[PDB]
């Protein structure tokens, strides 16, 4: 009697009766929030995980499933094959017939009355014992773990092993998969044996199972179903359909595969991005949060309409780009309304086609409105776009330069399609700081803390305009930097001599740090022409030349054996470069703020008021990756000086760092 | 009706108290593969510092 | 021989000869960057500070000014009266006649060869010895401070006191201002004495000096000049406009809040209002495109020019422009507010009551606003006055400002029928204004300690088809200056089904005695998208929860100055929750004897995937006013519990607050 | 042109070298009123640099 593909019993105590006939549970098993005596000796195998949560009245698991032997864990609950959490009145894991857990780990937590936790050797029942989680249960010091048998080493201790107060923990001899008493099972068997080394006499089959036989691989005309048995071609033609692929019967073709026409039981390899159509029942999918956009994950074509209304949110540009970055074709229209968090639509990268099957009232396919922070669309000179039908409406977008949307309809192909009110400079580009020329940098020179950068001389559009410059620089960990936010600003004037070009020297910078620098021109127009131009430069990313790294931190050394010294340390405070390796040296030893700060401000007043303008040998080894190493071949009980250096990628020219040294003596012979 | 912050047993107790006899749903159907889809449900929201309202408790519960 | 009003000797060593005749130096004295033997026994008094900096070759200050006795320091150099900085070859401060420095402190710094620093008791020469700064000189441990006399306590040590290796530090006896050897000077005298207790035999006068006499206050027909002598009326009639006589003092300019009297321009008359700065700028039209640009208009009363306000971006602007231009009252020319996208009101121009019109924009316009995207109101409310003498007014593309406001402006302005028909148009002005929106008149408010019930009148939308909903904006406001654009907690309550009940909302979880700003906005979803949309909104209602039991008194401290007495002090409660009336104190006799973080995220997944919704007696006294009281009649050396309560004006019905208690024991008998 | 940020003692010496025979001195001696200060001092000019050009030092030099 197979039961599945998933059992979820909760609330009613009496609903547990659904397990009266089941000997194998295909899928998971859920017994939650349960508030008498029910015994199920029929059940022996569970393919997936087993979950127990807040079951009142149950004192031991043996009361329900005494014959449960194998939890295959074909699919896991958060990488766990058995979860016993917040189980009140539960005293012990009474699964004294449990033998093998095939895949997952165990999480037993918050069971204030649970005993016999350390009395179970989980190393012979499952494999990944390191990833188990047994925290928050009753304390073994306050329990009384008593046996009524065998024993082995548990952690560093050796003690008896019992499941409950009447049954021990059963184990196979070292000669073997065994039967009840000392006879090895079949190699393809698992758990116990009704008869020794027989395929048709196995409580549970390892690998796969078919027609009462524990087979390693499925017979030729059978396919993998779930993770324990094999089914024929006609069986998966009745599941609702499923595909046959790689000798396996899954629900849907895997990634990079699509169903073949007519012969819809097999997957044909599509080479390009397979047409991942996402079809939603709601006519217009409204994206009002990052959670709402989750349903669009991995979609290539969207049969519907997109309504973006994102007021608040988290780190959004990288998040939507995870879900919607693969969308390429939108059948309907796209509306970005009230999306104040969006500064750019760049998260819609692969979007190259917008059709217009349904259009907003007035035949609009692209409709943006009231986006206070939308600086730029995703329409830069790299991306392509095509709106087949519909018009474009732009309104109340103050940070959007109007020129940017004129560039849009060139690629869009709807230059003369919209009306005169569809694009209005009054509410679009309202507070714009764009519409400027391009200042070009000329040269950059980098040191460990100084940066010399110069830009080309800028002649203002008018002869009378007084010209000045402003340098914006700030430390940027990575390149996603906007000009509106941080920025340190220094005003440098145009040099008097026309042969020298304007520049600035920055002082006091962190070694090996990427700085974002851009220059803006200060054009004071005597004739206040409302055709304002201005000049602005590109965001230039400059990293300091790598300096000599800092000394390693907290050098500690010990001796676990004679002629051996173990040393550990921390990475230096200021790496000043990509860490490459550490150079350690050991030599035999012979036997016997405000003040300077306050001075700063006082100093400046002086100059600001005086001047006035006229009107044993060393052994050396390199540690490649870790911050720990062991020295070998030493004189026993002899003092050693331990010099440790820290280099980086450019330490080949700069030279490696200084030494943070320590002294340690080896173990006596 | 306020977005109470309910966590650990208290979250379950809040669901248990709000539902009372209502409980939750336990029909066994045959299961399609990868039907586990669905994340960030109201149960998670209640535990968050923002919390979930008693109405939200009723929405996620029965 | 008086020399002044400031001596600045530098570069040339021989330029020091300018001190050959001076006995008193009126003002400061600079000896800078000097690279033989020059003696000036004439000099004795220095009014302002004395500065020495990088003088090479000088070994001691006694070589130049042996008779320097009093440095008045009327005006300080960075709060210093004497600065010895970077003096090379200098070995000691040879001012062995220095007696009194009246005002400032001392800063002697970076003199690697300077000795005799600790041998000088600056506590009897100056007053603010704590604010001195003697750092970076030759270390006393590495100098050799030796005397060739008297001594006293310096810091915690007692040691000899000498200026140089030949002269000691001279001091007056405890009986006295003394002469060379033990005879007290005159009370009005200072320093040394040519003859004992005589006015005409004093090296330096304290207070003031006139006609060879140390006088306390100036004679009736003399006035204070600088800070040491008195001069007559005709003297300050010759100093250079000229100097003023005010409060018996002869200063350079009239102090703040005073202006020069006409004709009699030697005295200051008290102007009551902001006295006229009268700001004249060379540029014809002053453009205020930033808060920095408006700085030049700080404190101006009348502006001879034109105002062009073009403020796109900015900081907190209303309070800043109000600081600069808030005092401007009269503008000779025209005023233009163009593109000023940050201005929501012109209230920063309060005292502006007159606009003349000397120069007018093309078309005879004196008041010209344009493209005021977020400007909702002028500064023209029924409180302010205004008069435009000549010119017209033009308003265009002014959406947020209501046209009725500018109609009300020309009533006070006096230009009702002067403008044309296109100067004030209703098309692009008031277009989407919400001032015209019908008020969601509140109906009732009910207040508790933490709950507020508030209801507003039912709102019938202008169209029959419009779907109507409400939104409640509430936030804690310490005071009333609250704008709708900022904070706000928003709750959407629907219109109740029954038409007899009016829409309301219940607020839960509020701080007792806290003023909340509440206003309701209507959500009118118009089926017919008529661009004649105004919406609906309500007035900002300030509601403070019913005065609740006050908070406990803060920081109860108690002590015992005597037996049978206990003094107790405390602070007012954190949340008074009403007007404080009195405190109730009670005294009772006491009888003699990542992991936890990682668990968090994993936890939420479990709940996020399991559950699924259905588809001795006390003595009591009252302290009336203060937060301090003294208990009398107590058992000596007995412990007492001190309960302190805090009541308010509504504590008669809601009860006095809880008790913040402390324990104290009286003094032993 | 580009010049090293110069402060403290070195700054004074650098100025002396540049000024040489010219030196530095106040154009008006013994002016009745102080010209004031707090901005545009060579302390600010070279500690945070817009370019401590030789000509800029020359303007300081008198």
Author numbering:
A (entry chain F): 1 to 35, 41 to 153, 162 to 189, 193 to 256, 265 to 509, 518 to 624, 683 to 705, 745 to 798
B (entry chain D), D (entry chain C): 1 to 62
C (entry chain E): 1 to 35, 41 to 153, 162 to 189, 193 to 256, 264 to 509, 518 to 624, 684 to 705, 745 to 798
The authors write:
To determine how LCDV1-VILP effects antagonism of hIGF1R, we performed cryo-electron microscopy (cryoEM) imaging of an IGF1R ectodomain construct IGF1Rzip prepared in the presence of a 30-fold stoichiometric ratio of scLCDV1-VILP (∼30-fold molar excess calculated per receptor αβ monomer). The initial reconstruction was readily interpretable, displaying a pseudo-two-fold symmetric arrangement of IGF1Rzip domains, with each L1-CR + αCT′ module engaging a scLCDV1-VILP moiety. Further ‘non-uniform’ refinement (NU-refinement) in cryoPARC (v3.2) led to a final map with improved resolution (GS-FSC 0.143 ca 4.6 Å), sufficient to permit unambiguous placement of the scLCDV1-VILP moieties and the domains of the receptor. Whereas the resolution varied significantly across the map (local resolution: min 2.4 Å, median 6.8 Å, 75th percentile 8.4 Å), highest resolution was achieved at one scLCDV-1 VILP binding site, permitting conservative morphing of an AlphaFold236 (AF2) model of scLCDV1-VILP to fit the density. Within our atomic model, the structural changes within each receptor monomer upon scLCDV1-VILP binding are seen to be considerably less marked than those induced by IGF-1 binding to the IGF-1R ectodomain. The L1 domain is displaced from its apo location adjacent to domain FnIII-2’ by only ∼13 Å, compared to ∼42 Å in the IGF-1 bound case. Such separation is greater than that in the apo IGF1R ectodomain and likely incompatible with signaling activation. Instead, the scLCDV1-VILP bound to domain L1 makes a sparse contact with domain FnIII-1′ in the vicinity of residue His539′.
Lymphocystis disease virus-1 (LCDV-1) and several other Iridoviridae encode viral insulin/IGF-1 like peptides (VILPs) with high homology to human insulin and IGFs. The binding of IGF-1 to the IGF-1 receptor (or insulin to IR) then leads to a conformational change that permits the receptor “legs” to come together, enabling transphosphorylation of the intracellular tyrosine kinase domains and activation of the receptor.
